[PDB]
Design a protein around this motif. Structure first.
Motif, PDB file in Angstrom:
ATOM      1  N   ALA A   1       0.768  -1.347   0.000  1.00 39.00           N
ATOM      2  CA  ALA A   1       0.000   0.000   0.000  1.00 39.00           C
ATOM      3  C   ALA A   1       0.769   1.349   0.000  1.00 39.00           C
ATOM      4  O   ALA A   1       1.709   1.502   0.739  1.00 39.00           O
ATOM      5  CB  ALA A   1      -1.052   0.075   1.138  1.00 39.00           C
ATOM      6  N   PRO A   2       0.363   2.360  -0.794  1.00 41.00           N
ATOM      7  CA  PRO A   2       1.142   3.627  -0.762  1.00 41.00           C
ATOM      8  C   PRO A   2       0.802   4.747   0.247  1.00 41.00           C
ATOM      9  O   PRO A   2      -0.320   4.971   0.592  1.00 41.00           O
ATOM     10  CB  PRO A   2       0.914   4.196  -2.186  1.00 41.00           C
ATOM     11  N   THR A   3       1.786   5.517   0.612  1.00 37.42           N
ATOM     12  CA  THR A   3       1.543   6.578   1.536  1.00 37.42           C
ATOM     13  C   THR A   3       0.756   7.764   0.993  1.00 37.42           C
ATOM     14  O   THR A   3       0.114   8.426   1.810  1.00 37.42           O
ATOM     15  CB  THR A   3       2.845   7.067   2.295  1.00 37.42           C
ATOM     16  N   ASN A   4       0.797   8.040  -0.326  1.00 36.15           N
ATOM     17  CA  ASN A   4       0.088   9.223  -0.856  1.00 36.15           C
ATOM     18  C   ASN A   4       0.402  10.537  -0.186  1.00 36.15           C
ATOM     19  O   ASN A   4      -0.449  11.421  -0.049  1.00 36.15           O
ATOM     20  CB  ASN A   4      -1.429   9.069  -0.834  1.00 36.15           C
ATOM     21  N   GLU A   5       1.645  10.639   0.255  1.00 31.58           N
ATOM     22  CA  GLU A   5       2.158  11.831   0.878  1.00 31.58           C
ATOM     23  C   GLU A   5       2.820  12.680  -0.163  1.00 31.58           C
ATOM     24  O   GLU A   5       3.233  12.211  -1.237  1.00 31.58           O
ATOM     25  CB  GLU A   5       3.086  11.464   2.009  1.00 31.58           C
ATOM     26  N   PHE A   6       2.862  13.947   0.163  1.00 26.78           N
ATOM     27  CA  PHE A   6       3.426  14.960  -0.675  1.00 26.78           C
ATOM     28  C   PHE A   6       4.468  15.703   0.113  1.00 26.78           C
ATOM     29  O   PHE A   6       4.323  15.821   1.369  1.00 26.78           O
ATOM     30  CB  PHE A   6       2.357  15.951  -1.040  1.00 26.78           C
ATOM     31  N   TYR A   7       5.496  16.186  -0.589  1.00 30.41           N
ATOM     32  CA  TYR A   7       6.558  16.976   0.002  1.00 30.41           C
ATOM     33  C   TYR A   7       6.712  18.313  -0.690  1.00 30.41           C
ATOM     34  O   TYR A   7       6.335  18.486  -1.804  1.00 30.41           O
ATOM     35  CB  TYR A   7       7.915  16.244  -0.047  1.00 30.41           C
ATOM     36  N   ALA A   8       7.308  19.253  -0.011  1.00 34.46           N
ATOM     37  CA  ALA A   8       7.639  20.524  -0.586  1.00 34.46           C
ATOM     38  C   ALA A   8       8.944  20.960   0.129  1.00 34.46           C
ATOM     39  O   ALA A   8       9.519  21.991  -0.275  1.00 34.46           O
ATOM     40  CB  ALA A   8       6.528  21.528  -0.306  1.00 34.46           C
TER      41      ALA A   8
ATOM     42  N   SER B  94      17.234  23.665  -4.659  1.00 37.16           N
ATOM     43  CA  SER B  94      16.347  22.738  -5.355  1.00 37.16           C
ATOM     44  C   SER B  94      14.938  23.187  -5.250  1.00 37.16           C
ATOM     45  O   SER B  94      14.036  22.410  -5.495  1.00 37.16           O
ATOM     46  CB  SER B  94      16.391  21.357  -4.728  1.00 37.16           C
ATOM     47  N   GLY B  95      14.715  24.399  -4.787  1.00 38.49           N
ATOM     48  CA  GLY B  95      13.365  24.876  -4.643  1.00 38.49           C
ATOM     49  C   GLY B  95      12.470  24.154  -3.656  1.00 38.49           C
ATOM     50  O   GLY B  95      11.242  24.010  -3.884  1.00 38.49           O
ATOM     51  N   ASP B 112      17.409  20.710   8.418  1.00 40.11           N
ATOM     52  CA  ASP B 112      18.158  21.771   7.763  1.00 40.11           C
ATOM     53  C   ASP B 112      17.403  22.439   6.679  1.00 40.11           C
ATOM     54  O   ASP B 112      18.010  22.860   5.725  1.00 40.11           O
ATOM     55  CB  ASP B 112      19.435  21.263   7.127  1.00 40.11           C
ATOM     56  N   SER B 113      16.090  22.517   6.807  1.00 37.81           N
ATOM     57  CA  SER B 113      15.282  23.078   5.755  1.00 37.81           C
ATOM     58  C   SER B 113      14.764  24.445   6.254  1.00 37.81           C
ATOM     59  O   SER B 113      14.735  24.624   7.523  1.00 37.81           O
ATOM     60  CB  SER B 113      14.103  22.142   5.427  1.00 37.81           C
ATOM     61  N   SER B 114      14.368  25.359   5.327  1.00 36.13           N
ATOM     62  CA  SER B 114      13.611  26.519   5.706  1.00 36.13           C
ATOM     63  C   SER B 114      12.524  26.159   6.763  1.00 36.13           C
ATOM     64  O   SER B 114      12.387  26.903   7.767  1.00 36.13           O
ATOM     65  CB  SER B 114      12.958  27.192   4.493  1.00 36.13           C
ATOM     66  N   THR B 148       4.655  26.048  -7.928  1.00 39.73           N
ATOM     67  CA  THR B 148       4.801  27.182  -8.864  1.00 39.73           C
ATOM     68  C   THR B 148       5.137  28.451  -8.142  1.00 39.73           C
ATOM     69  O   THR B 148       5.354  29.440  -8.757  1.00 39.73           O
ATOM     70  CB  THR B 148       3.511  27.452  -9.650  1.00 39.73           C
ATOM     71  N   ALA B 149       5.173  28.402  -6.822  1.00 37.79           N
ATOM     72  CA  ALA B 149       5.388  29.623  -6.076  1.00 37.79           C
ATOM     73  C   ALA B 149       6.791  30.158  -6.324  1.00 37.79           C
ATOM     74  O   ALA B 149       7.642  29.451  -6.863  1.00 37.79           O
ATOM     75  CB  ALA B 149       5.154  29.397  -4.627  1.00 37.79           C
ATOM     76  N   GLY B 150       7.008  31.405  -5.939  1.00 45.63           N
ATOM     77  CA  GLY B 150       8.281  32.044  -6.048  1.00 45.63           C
ATOM     78  C   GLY B 150       9.191  31.519  -4.944  1.00 45.63           C
ATOM     79  O   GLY B 150       8.923  30.462  -4.387  1.00 45.63           O
ATOM     80  N   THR B 151      10.301  32.208  -4.666  1.00 51.82           N
ATOM     81  CA  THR B 151      11.181  31.765  -3.620  1.00 51.82           C
ATOM     82  C   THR B 151      10.513  31.832  -2.274  1.00 51.82           C
ATOM     83  O   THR B 151      10.660  30.859  -1.480  1.00 51.82           O
ATOM     84  CB  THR B 151      12.369  32.692  -3.537  1.00 51.82           C
TER      85      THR B 151
END
Lengths: 8, 167, 168, 8
Positions: A1-8, B94-95, B112-114, B148-151
């Motif tokens: 099964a997958p986590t369906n998580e997102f990162y930013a 890496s945005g 170590d991230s924003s 798509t956001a800016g910095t």
């Protein structure tokens, strides 16, 4: 099964 | 003050499209239908209604609130998103701002991230991203607003407990 | 920003006066001792520590944070002040009354047609400051003294109970 | 028992 998580 | 008066006009069906909930003897916006007058004049989730046509909303039930709306001949004083706070972050080379989420809820902070440098909490919900509302959106589509956001990425967040209470 | 960087100096004993707790992968202030460099630097209950000596506190446990504090040579911390609090301003009526009933520093009732009713004060909230004085850890009796004695405008900062309970 | 509440 997958986590369906997102990162930013 | 974070308080403002908003004047609105009911619609074709006399609806205005809002749903309110009672929290802690206060009245809060639980739903805002888009392209609604309420939608128009700016109400958002988690905004608190101080009065309706000058009448204090304190201690009202959610039904009592609705009934007063379904009985006008509309002015509201509101206090704006009292439960959200704002966090500003900056993308990598890496945005990346460095957190992970699911169903709009922050789930992990990356070392170590924003997000780490700024004290992002886990178990919080995302409410806005760079001025745009995002409650009720799918994760796919919260992702591109991110993507798509800016910095600079300013978001606003709400602790999960009070988010669960308004829905 | 709610954000400031502060430098502190350890006491003759070597300690700064803090107890800290991990909440939600963050670090917050759970106790500040009086007259202790921590108190002197403005730290208050519910303040959030972002970095100690430049090291991100994110994902730390209270224990790890304390250890970092004990082991450092002389201390700098980045703090987001009172992220859990909100400001409500009320004006006393002719009777001198702002409208609410509290126990143990926690609001239990809102009077109808009272500045508190006008300003949307909520139940279940602890009062963390009145008119610029922290009341955290203060007997309701002392809190009342600040209140009766107070100027017609009353400004108090509140925190929701679920959070306050976690911090302690 | 007393409720020991205070009002303002």
């Amino acid at each position: 099964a997958p986590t369906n998580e997102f990162y930013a | 003050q974070g308080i403002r008066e908003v004047i609105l006009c009911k619609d074709q069906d006399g609806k205005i499209g809002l749903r309110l909930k009672s929290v802690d003897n206060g009245i809060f916006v639980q739903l805002v239908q888009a392209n609604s007058p309420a939608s128009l004049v700016g109400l958002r989730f988690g905004d608190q209604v101080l009065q309706i046509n000058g009448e204090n909303c304190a201690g009202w039930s959610s039904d009592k609130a609705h009934k007063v709306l379904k009985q006008a001949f509309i002015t509201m004083t509101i206090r704006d998103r009292p439960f959200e706070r704002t966090v500003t972050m900056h993308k990598d080379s890496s945005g990346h701002v460095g957190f992970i989420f699911k169903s709009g809820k922050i789930t992990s902070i990356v070392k170590d991230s924003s997000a780490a440098r700024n004290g992002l909490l886990t178990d919080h919900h995302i409410c806005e991203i760079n001025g745009q509302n995002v409650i009720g959106l799918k994760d796919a589509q919260i992702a591109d607003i991110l993507s798509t956001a800016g910095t600079v990425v300013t978001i606003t967040i709400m602790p999960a407990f009070i988010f669960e209470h308004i829905i």
